[PDB]
Amino acid sequence: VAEKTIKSMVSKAELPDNIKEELYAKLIEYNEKYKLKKDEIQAIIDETVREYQKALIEPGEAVGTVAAQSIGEPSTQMTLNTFHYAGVAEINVTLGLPRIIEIVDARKNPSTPIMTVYLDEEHRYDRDKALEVARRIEGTTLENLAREETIDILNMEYVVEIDPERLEKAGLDMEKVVRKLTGSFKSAEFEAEGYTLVVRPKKVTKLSDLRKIAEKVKKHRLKGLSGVGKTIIRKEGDEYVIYTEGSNFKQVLKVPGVDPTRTRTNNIWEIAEVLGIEAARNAIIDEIVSTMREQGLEVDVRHIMLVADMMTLDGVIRPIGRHGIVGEKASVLARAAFEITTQHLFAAAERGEVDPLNGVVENVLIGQPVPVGTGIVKLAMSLPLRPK
């Protein structure tokens, strides 16, 4: 009845059953305490082996076609949703059908990057200390602490202006005004009316072209780490999260306070270059899952793990059309009915190229039975054949 008695009844039966299954079956069987004793214990295990043996896949299946159809059906019923979501932190992340094209087609650029930032054990519960970490991530120049630029009369040429209230609620630290001299060119120190007068005692190179200085040092200021966009803080699960904007990975992971082991991303090519290919496996898988569940309608994750484990097939992730997997290695007729380009592509493989067989698009094109499905079985039969 006790521990030894049960565990070794599964151990004997084990060889057709699975490893995961074993742990599962025991931990529920033990739990039930109005207990059943011996004969129905053997009846349950000999029934669990029959359902697992009943539900294995038939050899010869056509996996790759029913993966592309069950991911392309739910995007046609993608009608309007509640675009007036009631959140604040996550902002403008292009929900719907235009996300699914951006994850399938590689597209180095992607619009609206939002990288989720999680925090460690020392910036977890402290409210205002978590704020200065988000201060350290954000970073601000001088151009966004203004509204426009007004010229002087003769020689002062510049002034700092409206407004100053970004330094009493976030705390952008008027001591940093002193700090400005860091590796700069001239760096005069004079604060009369709260703005630092910088004199330029030289000649013809800068005469009156104020507009080109707006691309130099006036814009090159980097007041804070991780030179990326704005940061929003939300309260979830007794940790503060910092839902930032943009994507600057190897700088962001080297920040004093971000927990490095858990920061998920809405980008594809950077998680492949930094964390490796098999991490970008899990970036593609976890992102198409999160789009489907938010829109109500579900797809099973056998279909997602066939596309993702085929799109990282050659060590660098590929796109899906006309430059990726169809444009990669195949028969030369397989590339003919996709990417109607053929004087680029069909006359290129005119030079030194054979073409055997063994696609699915060729044997249908030439008149042969395809290899998948029922063209996979091989028969044999003897011949006395008495009727009786």
Partner: protein, 196 residues
């Protein structure tokens, strides 16, 4: 034969049940179009239900009720003109079923709605083709019913059969019920031969 209202309740004749099996009412009324009740509180077409009272009011009174936008006949004044002419204020009436004959324990709604027939009639759609005249250039069937041609199976329809696993059907459908040609081919050159 596709019918429709002017509110957007399109549909097709389901069947054509005789007059004897009709759920009829505690008067001489036998309905014509037994509309599905699962379509009115799903599409938000309340103007259907206001017009149904407006047909019953403006047939018993004598004068065709004005129903123009924004200045027409109001809602509440109709339901009093029906209520003093001899009927319940909301259309509902006592109805007896015609198969067995007992009052259905509900009060079935009934009115007068103006429908209109559409020209998506069925005798301009049905065609069958066993083996007809073919294309001159490819020897494949033609296009359209006026030139006696069948359907065309795009790249969607080729892939929905490979998903099953049908490889025998995929040969017989695409090439055996199509053009087949026998060709003499050389061995060591690869080019086609020439009969004479």
């Amino acid at each position: 034969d596709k019918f429709a209202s002017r509110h957007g309740q399109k549909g097709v004749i389901g069947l054509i049940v005789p007059q004897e099996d009709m759920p009829w009412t505690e008067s001489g009324i036998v309905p014509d179009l037994i509309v599905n009740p699962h379509g009115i509180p799903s599409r938000m077409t309340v103007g259907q239900l206001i017009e149904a009272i407006g047909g019953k009011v403006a047939s018993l009174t004598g004068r065709r009720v004005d129903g123009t936008a924004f200045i027409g006949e109001p809602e509440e004044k109709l339901r009093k003109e029906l209520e003093e002419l001899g009927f319940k204020h909301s259309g509902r009436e006592i109805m007896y079923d015609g198969i067995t004959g007992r009052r259905l324990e509900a009060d079935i709604f009934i009115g007068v709605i103006y429908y209109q027939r559409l020209h998506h009639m069925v005798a301009d759609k049905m065609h069958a083709r066993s083996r007809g005249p073919v294309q001159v250039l490819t020897k494949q069937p033609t296009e359209g019913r006026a030139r006696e041609g069948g359907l065309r199976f795009g790249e969607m329809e080729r892939d929905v059969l490979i998903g099953h696993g049908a490889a025998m059907l995929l040969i017989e459908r695409l090439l055996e019920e199509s053009d087949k040609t026998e060709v003499w081919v050389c061995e060591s050159c690869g080019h086609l031969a020439l009969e004479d």
